[PDB]
């Protein structure tokens, strides 16, 4: 399959700080301030910064792709330290020489997934992937005087821990409350149109993110709109922040020996959730939201708020009584049988090293009420999946990840060493 690679190498004229002198308000964010943490005395831009460059497609998210590649297909660049851009003018600008290539295995040169959405794109009456975002994330440097945990890429060691992260099966995925990294600018590289040295206008994430949001929700409710639209639709907010000089002409060859990196779970409709304690009215006054989850996660609140692995409904929610000629004759019994037509495609990126097992949960508002009875352990329509009792049938198909032939076992991958990632 296609094997593309960009030689991200230049990121110059950055605004990391985010406090362009003409922004007045100078509370130099507690992410650019670097010194003896304190008052006027010590608090200023931190000599150099730590830059990381991820290359994500308009489908997945950036500050999470790292979560998979906390160590080191190839997408996350390496800690490149920045320098205080000189040149006349520019008082909060920054330069940095990443000089690292990114081998993104944009596999599939022909797929049904697109076909369907692609038709829905024209109104249902290398190409396909036409955009590659290269956002720069900044490692938050703590001031040299605070007494908290470290986050610096290079770090001293407490004997008894291998170069790994908090996602290992035994461990339970944590989601840093205080952000350990912020995105300081994305860059929409026009793939289709690709002494080379092509440039790119690093555009503030805020807008780019809001943009990526629309495209995302569009695909969800089976209504794909073309990026190009918003790119020239939203525009407006588009606020420049820097310039990443990239190298095109990689000439995609062929990949060797396949793997998974998706599941586009497509829920069709629920059937008889035995919702118990809840006023029939209050029930249909909730937000029936099915939320996917790659097993391991195992009910990790955070995920249940990510607007990517969650799909609520927009249709109506029928709430029948129960049994009839019985509970109806007995009255009360908050327990009720409820259904709904939650239509939408989710998309759970397969974490490299988690035995594939989607456990789509469903929470009226904030309460996992039912788990796909028994892990949908994939690896090897509607499967009439039963539902359980948490705090009895669902229609859903699992479009393949790249295109076909995928899903690696936790053990399977594990058995490959790989940057010691697996001892």
């Amino acid at each position: 399959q296609a094997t593309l690679r960009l030689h991200i190498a230049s990121i110059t004229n950055l605004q990391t700080s985010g406090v362009v002198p003409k922004r007045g308000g100078y509370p130099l964010p507690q992410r650019a301030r670097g010194g003896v943490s304190g008052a006027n005395g010590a608090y200023g831009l931190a000599p150099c910064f730590t830059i990381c460059t991820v290359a994500w497609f308009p489908e997945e998210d950036p500050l999470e792709i790292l979560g998979f590649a906390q160590g080191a297909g190839l997408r996350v660049s390496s800690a490149v330290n920045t320098r205080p851009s000189a040149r006349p003018g520019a008082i909060c600008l920054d330069d940095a020489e990443v000089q690292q290539e990114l081998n993104i295995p944009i596999s599939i040169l022909e797929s049904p997934w697109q076909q369907r959405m692609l038709a829905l794109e024209l109104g249902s009456n290398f190409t396909l992937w036409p955009f590659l975002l290269v956002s720069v994330i900044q490692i938050h440097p703590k001031l040299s005087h605070s007494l908290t945990i470290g986050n610096s890429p290079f770090r001293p060691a407490p004997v008894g821990t291998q170069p790994q992260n908090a996602i290992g099966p035994p461990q339970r995925v944590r989601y840093p409350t205080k952000s350990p990294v912020t995105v300081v600018g994305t860059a929409i590289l026009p793939l289709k149109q690709i002494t080379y040295l092509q440039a790119c206008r690093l555009f503030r994430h805020d807008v780019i993110r809001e943009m990526i949001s629309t495209y995302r929700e569009g695909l969800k409710r089976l209504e794909p709109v073309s990026l190009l639209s918003v790119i020239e639709a939203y525009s407006g907010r588009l606020s420049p922040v820097g310039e990443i000089f990239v190298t095109l002409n990689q000439l995609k060859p062929l990949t060797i020996n396949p793997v998974a990196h998706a599941v586009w779970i497509e829920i069709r409709k629920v059937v008889n959730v035995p919702i118990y304690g809840l006023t029939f009215r209050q029930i249909c006054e909730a937000e029936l939201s099915v939320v996917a989850m790659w097993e391991a996660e195992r009910a990790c609140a955070a995920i249940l708020r990510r607007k990517s692995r969650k799909i609520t409904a927009v249709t109506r929610c029928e709430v029948q009584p129960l049994n009839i000629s019985a509970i109806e004759r007995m009255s009360g019994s908050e327990d009720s049988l409820l259904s709904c037509y939650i239509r939408g495609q989710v998309c759970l990126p397969v974490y490299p090293g988690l035995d594939p097992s989607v456990v789509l949960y469903l929470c009226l508002n904030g309460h996992i009420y039912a788990t796909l009875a028994s892990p949908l352990n994939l690896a090897a329509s509607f499967r009439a999946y039963k539902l359980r009792s948490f705090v009895g049938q669902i229609e859903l198909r699992v479009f393949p990840c790249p295109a076909n032939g995928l899903f690696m076992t936790a053990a399977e991958f594990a058995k490959l060493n790989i940057e010691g990632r697996s001892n």
Partner: protein, 53 residues
């Protein structure tokens, strides 16, 4: 490019001239009267307005 550069706060009077064609009508003395009639009223203010001053 166009979104990047044309987003400018440098209007002030180049915006201010626009509402003086829409919802800021302001019919003043010179607009209401002809030049010959304006001299008639402004000469009538000689004896009738502000008689103490």
């Amino acid at each position: 490019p166009w979104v990047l550069a044309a987003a400018a706060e440098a209007q002030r009077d180049r915006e201010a001239e626009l509402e003086n064609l829409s919802r800021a009508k302001f019919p003043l003395v010179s607009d209401v009267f002809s030049p010959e009639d304006k001299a008639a009223y402004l000469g009538m203010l000689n004896a009738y307005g502000n008689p103490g001053g």
